[PDB]
């Protein structure tokens, strides 16, 4: 609710396996909340992906994400270094909901099917030997 | 060769040490030079400063003053302490070797080194270079004119 949609891509439609859900892509602009509220009565640009689900409940996920957000706020206030990504989701009709998609989605199952090996080999191929700085930073982020 | 003595690899520092030993063996007059001591004190001070510099923070690179180079450091505290302790012995070895032969010139150079304004401000802190310079002078000193020829 803190962004204004600009346009829709007319070639990004891709239904997935499943109940007839699909994926949509939009080009959007981020403005804010109060400014959006004032601008909606008179008439930093990125792209977003949305997944529409029909026939499934979307209420437990809201509790999970609220608790995740509260934990993130607590950790940020304390002064530690913990990383969590609270993607948003809103249910609108009985069994109908809209789910945000994290940028650059990369499922573990697909990577495992492609490689059929441990993630250590994948990381070594992607970044290099364990003696480099990039490997150290990736390890630090992974631990976090 | 001195600045390449602290490489991050394993065999690189060994071969650099061997080359330095050979070079100083065949050319003894480099011991009492007026530029080697300043450079080695500066790099020792740089390592001592880098000993505790928030390892989790990035950018492990450092710049040697008065000489265009850079130094990389390991991640764990133990490796950094080990490498600095290892380096802290060659300084004393070559200092005593230089003071053994020609005490006058090296003593004058050490006196000259201790008269810079930049280091005086930080002298209230550790400043390991000055401590090394003022500690290595004593136990390699000798007798004066009055007490140079006597029998115990």
From Swiss-Prot, chain B:
Compartments it resides in: Cytoplasm; Cell membrane
UniProt tissue specificity: Expressed ubiquitously. Highest levels in placenta and brain. Little or no expression in lung, liver, pancreas, testis or leukocytes.
Disease: Neurodevelopmental disorder with spasticity, hypomyelinating leukodystrophy, and brain abnormalities: A severe autosomal recessive disorder characterized by global developmental delay with impaired intellectual development and poor or absent speech, axial hypotonia, and peripheral spasticity and hyperreflexia. Brain imaging shows hypomyelination with decreased white matter volume, cerebral and cerebellar atrophy, and thin corpus callosum. Polymicrogyria may be observed in rare cases. Gastrointestinal defects and immunodeficiency syndrome 2: A severe autosomal recessive disorder characterized by multiple intestinal atresia apparent soon after birth. Affected infants have a distended abdomen, bowel obstruction and do not pass meconium. There is some evidence of inflammatory bowel disease. Death occurs in the first weeks of life. Some patients may also have immunodeficiency.
Family affiliation: Belongs to the PI3/PI4-kinase family. Type III PI4K subfamily.
Role summary: Acts on phosphatidylinositol (PtdIns) in the first committed step in the production of the second messenger inositol-1,4,5,-trisphosphate.
Quaternary structure and interacting proteins, as annotated: Component of a phosphatidylinositol 4-kinase (PI4K) complex, composed of PI4KA, EFR3 (EFR3A or EFR3B), TTC7 (TTC7A or TTC7B) and HYCC (HYCC1 or HYCC2). Interacts with TMEM150A; regulating recruitment to the plasma membrane. Interacts with TTC7A.
Protein name: Phosphatidylinositol 4-kinase alpha
Shown chain mapped onto the complete sequence: 971 to 1122 of 2102
């Amino acid at each position: 609710p803190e962004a204004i949609v600009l346009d829709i891509d007319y070639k990004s439609g891709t239904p997935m396996q499943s109940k007839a859900p699909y994926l949509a892509k939009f080009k959007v602009k981020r403005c804010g909340v109060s400014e959006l509220e004032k601008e909606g009565l008179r008439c930093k640009i990125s792209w977003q992906a949305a997944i529409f689900k029909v026939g499934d409940d979307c209420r437990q996920d809201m509790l999970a994400l609220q608790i995740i957000d509260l934990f993130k706020n607590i950790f940020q206030l304390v002064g530690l270094d913990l990383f969590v990504f609270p993607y948003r989701v809103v249910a609108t009709a009985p069994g109908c909901g809209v789910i945000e998609c994290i940028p650059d989605c990369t499922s573990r199952d697909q990577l495992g099917r492609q490689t059929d090996f441990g993630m250590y080999d994948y990381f070594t191929r992607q970044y290099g030997d364990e003696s480099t700085l990039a490997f150290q930073q990736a390890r630090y982020n992974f631990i976090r | 060769l001195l600045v390449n003595f602290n490489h991050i690899h394993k065999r690189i520092r060994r071969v650099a040490d061997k080359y330095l030993s050979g070079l100083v063996d065949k050319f003894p007059h480099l011991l009492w030079s007026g530029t080697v001591l300043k450079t080695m004190l500066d790099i020792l001070q740089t390592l001592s400063l880098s000993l505790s510099a928030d390892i989790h923070k990035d950018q492990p690179y450092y710049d040697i003053p008065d000489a265009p180079y850079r130094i990389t450091v390991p991640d764990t505290y133990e490796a950094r302490e080990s490498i600095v302790k290892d380096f802290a012995a060659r300084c004393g070895m070559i200092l005593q070797e230089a003071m053994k032969w020609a005490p006058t010139v090296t003593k004058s150079h050490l006196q000259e080194y201790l008269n810079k304004h930049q280091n005086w401000v930080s002298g209230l802190s550790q400043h390991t270079g000055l401590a090394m310079a003022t500690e290595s002078i004593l136990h390699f000193a000798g007798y004066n004119k009055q007490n140079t020829t006597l029998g115990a």
